[PDB]
Amino acid sequence: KQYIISEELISEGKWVKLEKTTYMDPTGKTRTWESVKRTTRKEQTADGVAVIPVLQRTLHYECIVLVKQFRPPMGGYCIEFPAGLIDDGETPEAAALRELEEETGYKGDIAECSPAVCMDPGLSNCTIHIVTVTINGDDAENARPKPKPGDGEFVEVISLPKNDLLQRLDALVAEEHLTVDARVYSYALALKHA
Amino acid sequence: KQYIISEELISEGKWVKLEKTTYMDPTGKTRTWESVKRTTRKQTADGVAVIPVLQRTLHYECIVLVKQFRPPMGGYCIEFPAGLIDDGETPEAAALRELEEETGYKGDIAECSPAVCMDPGLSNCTIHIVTVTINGDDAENARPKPKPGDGEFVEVISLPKNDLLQRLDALVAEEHLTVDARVYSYALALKHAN
Ligand SMILES: COC(=O)[C@@H]1C[C@@H](O)CN1C(=O)c1ccco1
Ligand SMILES: [Mg+2]
Ligand SMILES: [Mg+2]
Ligand SMILES: [Mg+2]
Ligand SMILES: [Mg+2]
């Protein structure tokens, strides 16, 4: 019943634009919305990937590998799944493994790959694939893992046990000003609930 | 080590603005970021999202979700019930209100996240994730009455918690819908637990 009638550019940066979106409501009436989009999306099936990296090691509880970085939009440090935009021609899987290595040093193995999922669909068209990767922490490749941060990338690795993820996140939030990402919090809540 | 120096307004709508953020990178080099912010924040966070468990005896527990046309997305999305927190409303009260408006269900608060970020590489948007249980055997949730605001058009989709990820993949396969990243993350962790 509902559909887009027109998308009018309001303001375009190098990376992000704002649009006036006109669409048809399900009563047959024309309405508008203010929409955000990235300028970087080409033929990618989504803007980006986020990696759920399950670190597995003999006689250790499984950990979820997270990253902490300063996020200018937020004016502060955030704790997130490793993530980045998908390069043109790159597959979501390749992007996930590459970003995981760049941000954490770990070399993972693909487990699963989501369909494209929406980041904040009342605001933006941004989408990611959520890629689950296992990391064999008993492999020598993953023994002394060093981030390969790109230019202006400064990332800290935080590995937390899956079996206590929500409380460990709460403890980090209790101890400094930082924001946990909504996907990470959602994943930790489901762990607790299951 | 990192911090905001200045924010330059690029463009301001009624609901969203685009800024150019200047910040200090950890080497001591000054850098810029294009950032989105909402114009509506006053609040602990911009919004709430509700994780609503429909608990009925002799039935599977269900997670209650909503499907709506999302103009930024150009299509229909499957999401946790959600909306912006009114000036002077608590996140818990917003959560019960939105859940009732969007689903007709009347629920009880179980727990409340701290403010969590939506897409911190792009925006400052935050929400509280509010876990709510719904006693599906109570008379008030027998024939749930959804009270949409102006221009909201919301379908309710309840899915069993124990098979949430498979059920969501199936809807994406069959219905050409976009699942929300937070919903998908929760669903993943229900499978990944233990
Ligand atoms: C153990 O029984 C429960 O009901 C747990 C405990 C409480 O934290 C909420 N909860 C959920 O499972 C839930 C609510 C929404 C989605 O899941
Ligand atoms: Mg990244
Ligand atoms: Mg990166
Ligand atoms: Mg809503
Ligand atoms: Mg609403």
UniProtKB/Swiss-Prot annotation, chain B:
Binding site for substrate: W15, W33, E34, R38, R70, L84, D119
Organism superkingdom: Eukaryota
CDD domains assigned to the protein according to its UniProt record, in alphabetical order: NUDIX_ADPRase_Nudt5
Tissue: Widely expressed. Most abundant in liver.
Record annotation: effect of changing E98Q: Catalytic inactive mutant for both ADP-sugar pyrophosphatase and nuclear ATP-synthesis activities. Reduces catalytic rate 6300-fold
Keywords for this protein: Acetylation, Hydrolase, Isopeptide bond, Magnesium, Metal-binding, Nucleus, Phosphoprotein, RNA-binding, Transferase, Ubl conjugation
Entry binding sites for Mg(2+) 1: A82, E102
Cofactor: how and how many bound: Binds 3 Mg(2+) ions per subunit.
Outcome recorded upon mutating T32A: Impaired phosphorylation; generates ATP in the presence of diphosphate
Subcellular location: Nucleus
Induction: Overexpressed in cancer patients with a poor outcome.
Consequence the record notes for mutating W15A: Reduces affinity for substrate about 8-fold. Strongly reduced catalytic activity and strongly reduced affinity for substrate
Keyword Zinc attached: no
Residue positions binding Mg(2+) 2: E98
Pfam families: NUDIX
Cross-linked residues, Glycyl lysine isopeptide (Lys-Gly) (interchain with G-Cter in SUMO2): K29
Listed GO MF terms: 8-oxo-dGDP phosphatase activity; ADP-ribose diphosphatase activity; ADP-sugar diphosphatase activity; identical protein binding; magnesium ion binding; nucleotidyltransferase activity; protein homodimerization activity; snoRNA binding
Modifications after synthesis and translation: Phosphorylation at Thr-32 is required for homodimer stability; dephosphorylation results in destabilization of the homodimer. Dephosphorylation at Thr-32 promotes the ATP-synthesis activity.
Outcome of swapping L84A: Reduces affinity for substrate about 6-fold
Protein family membership: Belongs to the Nudix hydrolase family.
Role: Enzyme that can either act as an ADP-sugar pyrophosphatase in absence of diphosphate or catalyze the synthesis of ATP in presence of diphosphate. In absence of diphosphate, hydrolyzes with similar activities various modified nucleoside diphosphates such as ADP-ribose, ADP-mannose, ADP-glucose, 8-oxo-GDP and 8-oxo-dGDP. Can also hydrolyze other nucleotide sugars with low activity. In presence of diphosphate, mediates the synthesis of ATP in the nucleus by catalyzing the conversion of ADP-ribose to ATP and ribose 5-phosphate. Nuclear ATP synthesis takes place when dephosphorylated at Thr-32.
Name this protein carries in UniProt: ADP-sugar pyrophosphatase
Organism: Homo sapiens (Human)
Lineage, broadest ranks: Eukaryota, Metazoa, Chordata, Craniata, Vertebrata
